[PDB]
């Protein structure tokens, strides 16, 4: 492990490194076990959930179709969203990630245990419903599980979908875009899936060059707030609000300088 995986020739992890070398269950155990010891991962997850709750429940971001871009094997980013969107389409470049996701959607006994995150989210929303009822709401809402490639003009290929009310992407674009032009390219590609006036919700690391799953290192585009804001505006969106938090992952997992969350509207 001298360099990030799949980065020898280009200097940045290639797309295909995720098909074969990204271990979804290892990723879930390292990042989303959500213990009670206030670890950096747990505090960050807590903050991600509160913003998602605030975005989809308090700010009333709602619609028919939400497309989740770069889901990986996680569902935490959909728990509040399924209260406000009739249909959820989850996408990722890695089929192994989608299969790990699909284990939970099918409620396989071997699926990852999300219940501490489910419990946290139910509490946020005022315990109007219990854990199982919440999980069934999400499972019902997820209609399709598709392959996506943000570097493509048609990120979902030929798959037919109506214009979406919201595109959501958490912790994805930094890892998927090897340079700033590709980053702007991807945001423009993502907008092709969105109605005019539709919502773009991005949450990602700030000034991060890599992240770790065990001894596996993966590349990350280190972007500061100003670059993100410029790229989003240039790609044809108007920013509704932009938040930056200084809380960082432990260096054994990422060298990030906090995270950002933003809500934009397609022009
Ligand atoms: N940058 C950081 O510092 C930092 C900090 C913390 C965690 C992480 C992390 C991660 C792993 N994941 C799951 C994120 C999940 N959404 C969550 O929120 O946990 C990222 C996605 C990207 C996705 N990918 C790759 C190429 C690609 C294309 Cl071309 N088109 C669409 N997707 C693509 C790849 O498959 C993988 O699944 C990074």
Automatic annotation (TrEMBL):
Span of the signal peptide: none
This protein's GO CC annotations: cytosol
One GO term (biological process): methylation
Keywords, ordered alphabetically: Methyltransferase, S-adenosyl-L-methionine, Transferase
Superkingdom to which the source organism belongs: Eukaryota
Residues that, per the record, bind S-adenosyl-L-methionine: 27, 32, 70-71, 76, 92, 97, 149-150
GO molecular function, one term: nicotinamide N-methyltransferase activity
KW RNA-binding (keyword) present: no
Family the UniProt entry places it in: Belongs to the class I-like SAM-binding methyltransferase superfamily. NNMT/PNMT/TEMT family.
UniProt cross-references to PANTHER family, sorted A to Z: NICOTINAMIDE N-METHYLTRANSFERASE, NNMT/PNMT/TEMT FAMILY MEMBER
Protein name: NNMT protein
Organism: Homo sapiens (Human)
Name of the gene encoding the protein in the UniProt record: NNMT
